[PDB]
Amino acid sequence: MQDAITAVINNYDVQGKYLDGAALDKLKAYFTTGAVRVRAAAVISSNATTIIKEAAAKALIYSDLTRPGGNMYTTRRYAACIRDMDYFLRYATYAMLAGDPSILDERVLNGLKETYNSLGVPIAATVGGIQAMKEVVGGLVGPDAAKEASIYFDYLSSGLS
Amino acid sequence: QDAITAVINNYDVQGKYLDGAALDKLKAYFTTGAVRVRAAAVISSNATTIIKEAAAKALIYSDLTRPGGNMYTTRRYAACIRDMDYFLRYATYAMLAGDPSILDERVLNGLKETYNSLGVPIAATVGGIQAMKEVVGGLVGPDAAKEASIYFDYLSSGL
Amino acid sequence: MQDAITAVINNYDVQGKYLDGAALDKLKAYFTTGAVRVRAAAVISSNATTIIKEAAAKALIYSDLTRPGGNMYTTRRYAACIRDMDYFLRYATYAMLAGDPSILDERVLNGLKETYNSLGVPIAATVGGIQAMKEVVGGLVGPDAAKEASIYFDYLSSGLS
Amino acid sequence: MQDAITAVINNYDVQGKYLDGAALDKLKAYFTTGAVRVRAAAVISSNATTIIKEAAAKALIYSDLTRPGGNMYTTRRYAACIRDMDYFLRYATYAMLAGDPSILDERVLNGLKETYNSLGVPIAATVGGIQAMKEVVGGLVGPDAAKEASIYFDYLSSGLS
Amino acid sequence: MQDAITAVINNYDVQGKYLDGAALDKLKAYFTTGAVRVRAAAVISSNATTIIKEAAAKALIYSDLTRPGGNMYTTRRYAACIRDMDYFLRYATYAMLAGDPSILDERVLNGLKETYNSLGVPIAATVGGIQAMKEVVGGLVGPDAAKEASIYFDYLSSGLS
Amino acid sequence: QELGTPINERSIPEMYVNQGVPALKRQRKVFKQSQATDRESFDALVTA
Amino acid sequence: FKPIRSKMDIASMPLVQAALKEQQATKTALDMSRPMFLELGRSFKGAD
Amino acid sequence: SVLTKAIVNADAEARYLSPGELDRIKSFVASGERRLRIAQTLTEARERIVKQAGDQLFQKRPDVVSPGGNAYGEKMTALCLRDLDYYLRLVTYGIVAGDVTPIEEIGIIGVKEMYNSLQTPIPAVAEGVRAMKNVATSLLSGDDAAEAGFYFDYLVGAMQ
Amino acid sequence: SVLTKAIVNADAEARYLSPGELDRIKSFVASGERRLRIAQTLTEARERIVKQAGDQLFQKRPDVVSPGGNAYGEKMTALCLRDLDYYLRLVTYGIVAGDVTPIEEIGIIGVKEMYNSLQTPIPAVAEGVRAMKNVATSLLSGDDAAEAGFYFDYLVGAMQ
Amino acid sequence: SVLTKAIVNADAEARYLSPGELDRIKSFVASGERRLRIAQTLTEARERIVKQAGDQLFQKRPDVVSPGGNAYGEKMTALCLRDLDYYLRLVTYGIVAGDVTPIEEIGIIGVKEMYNSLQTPIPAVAEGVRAMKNVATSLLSGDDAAEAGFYFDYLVGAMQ
Amino acid sequence: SVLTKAIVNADAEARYLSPGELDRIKSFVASGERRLRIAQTLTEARERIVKQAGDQLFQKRPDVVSPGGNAYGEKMTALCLRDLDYYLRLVTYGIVAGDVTPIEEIGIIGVKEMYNSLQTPIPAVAEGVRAMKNVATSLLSGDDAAEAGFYFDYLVGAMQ
Amino acid sequence: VLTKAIVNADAEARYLSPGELDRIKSFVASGERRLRIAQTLTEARERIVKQAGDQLFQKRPDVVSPGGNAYGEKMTALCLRDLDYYLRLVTYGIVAGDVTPIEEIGIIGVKEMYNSLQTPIPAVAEGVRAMKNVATSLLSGDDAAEAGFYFDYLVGAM
């Protein structure tokens, strides 16, 4: 995938330019942010199960979806939906460490709309769930991390919608 | 066009460079300008009322509004008040400009012919314009009124 | 007494509110100022004797007060006056570190006017001395510190007058 | 140049009118102010070197200008700037005695902007210096004199800017 | 004016930097070229009259200019033109020794275009003469010196045009 | 205050702008012969 | 598989953006472990 | 707070602040920004911390939420949760202050007497605070958790 | 002039003049007196400006005054100077108007076509206008020159 | 980059990053500043490194710059030096990344095929890289040199 | 620089450079490499030269670093040392230039006026420069020292 | 610093708090840097004392005057010896990270000792101030700030 360090490198490589101070400064900026990111990632991993639970409670469950004839009705479908939620969370965590939204595009975002349409999964509900996870995540990670975390969640949401 | 441009155009046909005498005429306009701007703002704010008052004076409570009259039916009534608004807006433009030409170019040109085809009564329309003038005169105040009146009269004479 | 941090806490506690961003900002403001204040306090402590000397020279001495029949005439009274000056200086320094005027009210300001009136100590002259100390202190502490230092000196002066 | 007395005379001369009471009143007004002005001028002349020093300290020195690559860097440039400051002070004093701003326009203000732009001298910094001198001057002259002094300083500042 | 050595110094002075090896290398480069330049200058000075003669023969004379109604017609005008040619040669020699084009800008180039336009002297013909002088000079100085000499001649030509 | 804030953050404000019918529809200008009664107006008409 | 362009630059992301301001703003101040006399002589703008 | 304590000691001695005392103040002001973040984290997670801790407490002590028990009934259960929330708010105040004093004045003095009149069991309350600590620790990073733990421990120590 | 511009925008919108638009009109009428002085200055210097500019142009372009060139011959040279004079008169009109519109109607529409029939080179005409600008700028004070420059620049842009 | 590599391993396992893996990321970000300086040094000395290495290579291999040889002629010699420059740029990229992957994608995959079409000898290219390493090592401090050496060695290994 | 001085004299005379003048230029270019080394030496030892000279100056003049004196206080003492550093930088520039002109423009014109406004004593400044000379002389070789001495002496002569 | 922390704990009758322990950890890390700062002043000690002495004598002509205590070779040496003593104490302070070492040796009973000697206390204070200025110049800025605190304390004490 691509990360901030590699993104700078790639931009320079297409130009053919050797790395310069301005480029170095961007790299330096990333290095400082890194420590914060690692702490945030550890928080998310530990609380992943709860984050999903809370988000589902906020948006998915106690709804027509869970009621018979709904997309999340039946154990199989319910389990699938929470598995998808976990995917989104894991990838967002990866993106946050990376400092780049590209991984989301390469793995999660590509073909998702089409997959969902064939499946008949409701996109808007999924987006709702992602937004819910974001809110929960924001609390756990704390303020400095929150802003960074939010952008990746929003990126996923925009892609799906 | 405008007073300033009118002076310029007169010089251009002569081919003369701008002279002090010409400058004095322009200067005269510039002093009047401030008054005109104030008058225009007054008219814009009170435009709806001006039309209402003028209509009350001439158009309504009349045969025109009664069945078989030109302004009978909602559609015709609305058209007449729209025309009244046009006259007011253009007169305001003319007053700022200091020139009657805009009235000729937009409002006056082809209006008589249009009205004759439509069967709209010109004299009644003229009456309405005169009524608007009277109302406008009050609001603008005396110094402004003289300037405002000439454009209203110009419209009336054209029609 | 109370300090800036505790003052914020107390205001929130009476409301029963958890600490909020606006409150956090006030706390953050204090924290930045803190380092400057500590430096200022050390300067004042080291130069305290001189500060008093200079201020006395500016207002108190070479005056009717020191001359016979004046309030600060006799060694005993002279010594008392410079002791009072030292008190004001020490308390102002405490207040500056704290970031709150309350300590001045609780210790120095309470009953001072009444005490002085019974004693026959002249309030206006005392105020003059406090203002003089402020000016001397301002120089030593430097500009950023001076603004902070000045408010506490002014607080004392206003109380007495 | 022109002074207040001559300004009145000149206005009457173009009219061809003999001096009248209204004119006399303006002259009388000036005559009362005169004594104050003379005292102020003497104060400024005696303290001129210090006034410049203080004003430079307030604005010009300990700054980027004095640091290498700044306009007032190098001895030659430093000396030039203080020479200009002296000019402004001397002319303002002349204007204050005269009671008329015209001399400033005729000598100082005319062509200064253009000169400065060619030189690359920064106008805003110069204006800052003039304002600083005004503040210092205000103190020395005292309040009644200060008001009169201030207008000429402000006139110079407005002209440059 | 400026020279190569001073140019390096001035660049460092605005930075405030002490002289460094990279700077020293530029200075060292100049020092090697120096010996060649001195030899070239002596050659030009000795052959100056001839250089002008040859260049005039190449461009100026046997032309409409020299014929009646031409700018260089009449003895006075002819003499003026050859005087100007000498100026250009002398200044170019100075520039070559200096290793900097600045002197040309400060003395020769400044206001010349405007002067010539008012006079009605033809700039293109003058430029032609300068180019002719360059060619003659190139021969006498020899190849290594010629490259250095050429740049200053070209600088003059570009300025005039 | 709460009833006019977004429930969800809107963490990349640009995404939420430029949703809907594109702005182009509103930006464009209409041209008529009635406006043509000037030499410049007429030139604009024709270009349009 | 068609390769994908970048929607957002590294500098737009909040944490980087902040760190850039911190280095950029207050890039020039006072250096510790530098003798003051050397620091007072140091130039900020440099070239230009 | 740290600063209040230092000032008070100086005033008692009637002296200007000692260098050592000044150094402690310096350390505290540097620590403050980190402390603020720790407090902020707990505030945001407050609702969940209380909820989780409550459930744990009720599992640990069935009796309190039983017909005999004090906590039993909706009104009573709400009050029990409100109390837990109060203690959490106090803990946050403590972290920013850098001292237990803020906590102590509001919550730990006369606590025994108040609860005895209410007839609330003090040990159960302590368990609830312990439960809150565990939840809070999980959300906090390790070093942050240790800092928070001290304040939580103090509360537990105060209430027995 | 400017006021015409404002009115025209209002008429297109079919609305009364906006307050902001009215304010701009007010500013313009105040500025007019200053503008008149600037125009007066150029008018007085007109004869010299044209003469100087002509000479500069002929030096810049020998070809125009050459047997092939359009300007060549006394009759033709006079006409070329007359054209320069015309453009200067237009510029003065522009300054007083505060708009290029007066200039534009008389001089810039169909200019290409007219000169192409004449066979006069358009770039040379532009150079002449540029030359006039430089002369005019020198006589004008700096701020006055900037105002005049805009109108001169427009002409150069139009004939290009 | 190191971080990309860690993420990729996690994604294959379909798990969140392990604490140990996270720790390695932390170490890398700390190391980065030192790495940036090492890269900066080589960039500044780039021109000289290439020049010196080229000369060494040509001495080591007379054949390459011989009428038969590929490198022979000005055009060809320039291209050979350009290639050396390319590899140096790649090495700098590698040092900042902390991984050979950036180097590998741009330079080491399909290299054999490209050079075989060109008919350039691969071993000579490797020698040039070795030569560049020696020059670079001298300018770098010992510990810095070791770090740089690893990347240089990888390139030499790749071109084998 | 030497070259600038020669050109200026020639231009005043309105003549090409004299043989004698040319010879001096030749001598200068030969000397330059030696001069560069002398300058380099002082630059490396700059920090210590300033420090040592400062101490000597303060010993020589107790007054300057006394409550009355200008130099007194840390801020002021730093500024005094900064001034010494400035003069040293100027001297190095002079040595490479081979003339005092570079030194003179930056440091010696208006120096009296600047210091008089500051109220700094000019003789004390001169002593500081003398002190710097002595330190610099010790590090330099004898012949090198003599060359450096001339520039140092000029400064002392300029400001007294 | 460690002694101070322990003493506060003992008064409270509690084990050291984690925060208190952390401060101890920071101090032990800082110590090596502190040792270097002290080493610098030790090397420059002879010159610092000499320079400070001269400054003091310029500031106070009286002390080295026939009336004054410092006057005469023997007395002047003793005055310089005293300045040296205070410098040694300052170095000890920097390594300790506390003023206590300084305080015990130099600041308790100082008034009484000097009053018997008849040495003026203000002059002694000036000498310490003078030493600070010299020491600050040799030290780097951050190092100087650390050293300044100890110097200031002495001046305050005297």
Ligand SMILES: *[C@H](C)[C@H]1/C(=C/c2[nH]c(/C=C3N=C(/C=C4\NC(=O)C(CC)=C4C)C(C)=C\3CCC(=O)O)c(CCC(=O)O)c2C)NC(=O)[C@@H]1C
């Ligand atoms: C009862 C013996 C146990 C119990 C049940 C319980 N369930 C929920 C909530 C839900 N349970 C389901 C289950 C199903 N959905 C399906 O499609 C199927 C197969 C057809 C099942 C069985 C779902 C979807 C929900 C979510 C709510 C919804 O329908 O939208 C709860 C409460 C949820 C909560 O935890 O808040 C409970 C209590 N709980 C016990 O402890 C009993 C042992």
Ligand SMILES: *[C@H](C)[C@H]1/C(=C/c2[nH]c(/C=C3N=C(/C=C4\NC(=O)C(CC)=C4C)C(C)=C\3CCC(=O)O)c(CCC(=O)O)c2C)NC(=O)[C@@H]1C
């Ligand atoms: C003379 C032997 C010594 C000496 C004297 C000295 N005194 C002052 C200033 C003051 N002296 C006093 C003292 C008194 N005020 C009292 O009320 C009493 C008892 C009745 C005494 C003895 C005061 C109040 C002052 C302050 C100024 C004033 O008079 O209002 C000075 C000047 C201090 C200064 O630095 O400004 C001096 C010199 N000094 C010596 O060294 C002699 C040995």
Ligand SMILES: *[C@H](C)[C@H]1/C(=C/c2[nH]c(/C=C3N=C(/C=C4\NC(=O)C(CC)=C4C)C(C)=C\3CCC(=O)O)c(CCC(=O)O)c2C)NC(=O)[C@@H]1C
């Ligand atoms: C004949 C008596 C002697 C002689 C003449 C000679 N002249 C030239 C070349 C030129 N002579 C002139 C002279 C003038 N130009 C003017 O404007 C005037 C005044 C109106 C004069 C007198 C010029 C300009 C030239 C240069 C060529 C040109 O016209 O462009 C030559 C040729 C020399 C050469 O190499 O160019 C000669 C031979 N020389 C003698 O020996 C006779 C005694």
Ligand SMILES: *[C@H](C)[C@H]1/C(=C/c2[nH]c(/C=C3N=C(/C=C4\NC(=O)C(CC)=C4C)C(C)=C\3CCC(=O)O)c(CCC(=O)O)c2C)NC(=O)[C@@H]1C
């Ligand atoms: C010769 C290649 C061309 C030529 C020369 C020419 N020049 C003049 C007259 C003047 N030339 C100058 C030039 C300068 N004055 C300066 O101060 C400087 C720079 C510092 C220069 C280079 C000036 C000012 C004059 C006027 C007064 C004077 O000559 O001293 C002429 C005669 C013009 C006249 O009418 O007097 C001539 C012939 N002209 C050509 O046609 C050649 C191509």
Ligand SMILES: *[C@H](C)[C@H]1/C(=C/c2[nH]c(/C=C3N=C(/C=C4\NC(=O)C(CC)=C4C)C(C)=C\3CCC(=O)O)c(CCC(=O)O)c2C)NC(=O)[C@@H]1C
């Ligand atoms: C309402 C439940 C949801 C909603 C509506 C919404 N629609 C638009 C825009 C368009 N609507 C249509 C749709 C149709 N055209 C058709 O012919 C038919 C079938 C007969 C339909 C249903 C079209 C073409 C547009 C775009 C063109 C237009 O608006 O004229 C918008 C955007 C409108 C805008 O101005 O931006 C919206 C908001 N959106 C919601 O959130 C509801 C869930």
Ligand SMILES: *[C@H](C)[C@H]1/C(=C/c2[nH]c(/C=C3N=C(/C=C4\NC(=O)C(CC)=C4C)C(C)=C\3CCC(=O)O)c(CCC(=O)O)c2C)NC(=O)[C@@H]1C
């Ligand atoms: C040290 C030997 C003496 C001393 C120094 C001193 N200087 C200042 C202030 C300034 N010094 C300068 C000097 C220069 N600017 C230049 O461009 C150059 C040449 C390159 C020099 C030498 C300047 C401009 C200032 C003004 C402040 C500033 O830099 O912004 C001071 C303090 C000024 C004051 O107190 O007002 C001092 C102490 N003073 C002595 O007495 C020493 C003998």
